Amino acid sequence: GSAKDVKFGADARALMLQGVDLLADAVAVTMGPKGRTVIIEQSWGSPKVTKDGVTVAKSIDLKDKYKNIGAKLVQDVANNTNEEAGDGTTTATVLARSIAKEGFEKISKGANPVEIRRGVMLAVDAVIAELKKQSKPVTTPEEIAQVATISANGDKEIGNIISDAMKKVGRKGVITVKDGKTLNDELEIIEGMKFDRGYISPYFINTSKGQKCEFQDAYVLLSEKKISSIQSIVPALEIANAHRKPLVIIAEDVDGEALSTLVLNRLKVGLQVVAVKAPGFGDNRKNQLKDMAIATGGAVFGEEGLTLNLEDVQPHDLGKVGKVIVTKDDAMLLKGKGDKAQIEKRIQEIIEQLDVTTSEYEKEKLNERLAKLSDGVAVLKVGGTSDVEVNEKKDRVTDALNATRAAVEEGIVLGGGCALLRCIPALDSLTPANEDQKIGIEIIKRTLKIPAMTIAKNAGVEGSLIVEKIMQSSSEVGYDAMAGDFVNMVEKGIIDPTKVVRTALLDAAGVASLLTTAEVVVTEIP
């Protein structure tokens, strides 16, 4: 293969550690309320600014291949943490560096870095246990706004708007975030099944106010094929006029004689029908019509395999919806009736799809957004006066959103970094099997102090004074680095979801403890 060059021992370790230390030093300035931003040059456009640890970490590759190895491993840590939790990234980075340094330094000739790894892993298991003991599950929706506001670097309006969206959509509902054109944030809430297709004919309109067709207690007909009929349409109308209900028809297109029947029966006798095009993109529309089928209760006509033909309809083959509103541009269906088991089955199917499907043909979320919650879906239109600002703010809101979900699903624990600090006594009551494992437990024991001391160091104060003052003080009190003084943590609102504190530590220790086991590194020649 490619010509290569190899390096042995603490010499090479010092290089990889140089890379780790560089990347960590770049990431760590963002940490906490008094943290600061990092500008990253973009190849094509104007530069990004970010406070996100992981986005800083991924941006830094290094010319020196060994230092680049270290860097790649640390950004591996920050990326794993961001994927598994969505916050706690800077923390995972500084933790990873601390474990890597304290690891590397303690190795000698007699030492056994694999066994030391075993010891640190023991120590982190023991720590996350005590973390779970410390966890108190979220209750009041004030705590939601607190977790959000703290994860958004002190922006109260962010955690307010997130609290509102999460209230109006539900704690495990769908919230998504995108750019506003407005200079301020907006919360929009959509309920139903909305998609961007409008009535084929103006003649379908019911209300002269808004120019909408508005229906309630309506039927739905779903056709995967065109309806140029053939009059495969008529039984579907006879069946509708029979039970005196309005009928909405969704199809690849509805035209030829079909449309003529539709707008003749609409304009003369006062029949209640609308026809709209399928959401429409090839193989995607098939999946969408199957979604609306499953949600509204009923079945899709045309070719899947077993073909259900339009001539032979039954009322149980249609669909049933609480309300429907259609305009020139878009169609919304509301309160559709079907098996809730079958719909949640469907959502469980699409999430497990998108999760494996590294495709970035992300309309699968547009599907997931469509097959609607419980209580609905929320769009977060972020404002600001400039694109770079918008990207910063949106990074922070995405962080706060992921943080709130982690909080509701696992728990909340003390902020500052105190949650990791309080776990040290749990390490003090450990029973190491040998010197190596003891070294590991010592490494974790030192490493736990780091996040709090770093948040304080960014404040411009003597962080390691503050860590020890916190340790001498009671369990409920910690350091408010923004206000610059000690306070009750949970009372003052400074709190972190337990899931992020767990995942940051687990990932960081997980990769760094493996890094410390290295004795020889092999790299490509420039």
Of 518, 395, 453, give the one whose Cα is nearest residue 73.
518
Q: Among residues 19, 22, 24, 87, which is the contact residue for Mg ion, using CB under 5 A?
A: 87
The reply to whether 365 sits in an annotated binding site is no
Nearer to a copy of itself, 49 or 126 (CB): 49
The reply to whether 496 sits in an annotated binding site is yes
**Residues 368-397, interacting with a copy of itself (CB under 8 A):** 384-389, 392
Instruction: Please state, in angstroms and as integers, the Cα–Cα distance from residue 441 to each residue in 117, 127, 451, 502, 517, following that order.
Output: 9, 10, 17, 17, 16
Q: Name every residue whose Cβ is closer than 8 Å to that of residue 257 and which is 6 or more positions away in sequence.
A: 228, 229, 230, 231
**Residues 386-425, interacting with ligand ADP (CB under 6 A):** 415-417
Residue count at the site for a copy of itself (CB under 8 A)?
91
Interface segment toward a copy of itself; rule CB under 8 A; list 112-120, 171-179, 215-223, 486-494: 112-120
CB 268 within 8 A of CB 298: no
**Residues 397-456, interacting with a copy of itself (CB under 8 A):** none
Strands 485-488 and 477-480: antiparallel
Q: How far is the CB of 457 from Mg ion (least distance, A)?
A: 17
Which residue blocks in 85-190 are alpha helix, DSSP H?
A: 89-106, 113-134, 141-151, 156-169
**Residues 464-483, interacting with a copy of itself (CB under 8 A):** none
Residue count at the site for ligand ADP (CB under 6 A)?
26
Site string for Mg ion, 133-152 (x = CB under 5 A): ------------------x-
If one asks whether residue 102 binds Mg ion (CB under 5 A), the answer comes out as: no
If one asks whether residue 143 binds ligand ADP (CB under 6 A), the answer comes out as: no
Q: How far is the CB of 474 from a copy of itself (least distance, A)?
A: 28
Q: How large is the C-alpha radius of gyration of the chain?
A: 29
CB 66 within 8 A of CB 515: no
HSE-CB of 492 using CA atoms within 13 angstroms: 19
What are the b/e assignments for 477-488, b being 16+ CB within 10 Å? Answer: bbbbbbeeebbe
Q: How far is the CB of 463 from a copy of itself (least distance, A)?
A: 13
Nearer to a copy of itself, 22 or 467 (CB): 22
Site string for Mg ion, 387-426 (x = CB under 5 A): ------------x---------------------------
> What tokens does 298 get?
């009923």
Instruction: Please state, in angstroms and as integers, the Cα–Cα distance from residue 398 to each residue in 170, 380, 395, following that order.
Output: 17, 10, 5
Nearer to ligand ADP, 114 or 183 (CB): 114
User: How many angstroms separate the CA atoms of 160 and 87, rounded?
Assistant: 19
Nearer to ligand ADP, 54 or 73 (CB): 54
If one asks whether residue 359 binds a copy of itself (CB under 8 A), the answer comes out as: no
Interface segment toward ligand ADP; rule CB under 6 A; list 184-192, 423-431, 463-471, 479-487: 479-487
Of 145, 298, 311, give the one whose Cα is nearest residue 231.
311
User: How many angstroms separate the CA atoms of 238 and 234, rounded?
Assistant: 6
If one asks whether residue 87 binds a copy of itself (CB under 8 A), the answer comes out as: no
Nearer to ligand ADP, 376 or 478 (CB): 478
Cis peptide upstream of residue 375 (ω within 30 degrees of 0): yes
If one asks whether residue 279 binds ligand ADP (CB under 6 A), the answer comes out as: no
User: How many angstroms separate the CA atoms of 149 and 164, rounded?
Assistant: 13
Nearer to ligand ADP, 32 or 336 (CB): 32
The reply to whether 416 sits in an annotated binding site is yes
Interface segment toward a copy of itself; rule CB under 8 A; list 30-38, 133-141, 314-322, 467-475: 30-38
Site string for a copy of itself, 285-314 (x = CB under 8 A): ------------------xxxxx-------
DSSP string, 220-261: EEEESS-B--SS-SHHHHHHHHHTT--EEEEES-B-HHHHHH
The reply to whether 176 sits in an annotated binding site is no
CB 50 within 8 A of CB 35: no
User: What residue type is assigned to position 108 of the chain?
Assistant: S
CB 218 within 8 A of CB 295: no
CB 495 within 8 A of CB 149: no
**Residues 19-78, interacting with ligand ADP (CB under 6 A):** 30-33, 35, 51, 53
Torsion over CA: 379, 380, 386, 388 (sign):
negative
**Residues 170-229, interacting with a copy of itself (CB under 8 A):** 183, 200-201
If one asks whether residue 58 binds a copy of itself (CB under 8 A), the answer comes out as: yes
Contact of residue 76 among Mg ion, a copy of itself, ligand ADP, none (CB under 5-8 Å per partner type): a copy of itself
The reply to whether 37 sits in an annotated binding site is no
Of 74, 123, 101, give the one whose Cα is nearest residue 507.
74
Partners of 274 in the β-ladder: 248
If one asks whether residue 155 binds Mg ion (CB under 5 A), the answer comes out as: no
Interface segment toward ligand ADP; rule CB under 6 A; list 87-95, 191-199, 326-334, 405-413: 87-95
- E strand or H helix that includes residue 313: none
If one asks whether residue 497 binds ligand ADP (CB under 6 A), the answer comes out as: no
Contact of residue 373 among a copy of itself, Mg ion, ligand ADP, none (CB under 5-8 Å per partner type): none
Which residues of this chain interact with ligand ADP, rule CB under 6 A?
Answer: 30-33, 35, 51, 53, 87-91, 150-151, 153, 415-417, 451, 455, 479-482, 494, 496
Which residues are at the interface with Mg ion (CB under 5 A)? Answer: 87, 151, 399
- Binding-site residue numbers are 51, 87-91, 416, 496
Q: Which residues line the annotated binding site for ATP?
A: 51, 87-91, 416, 496
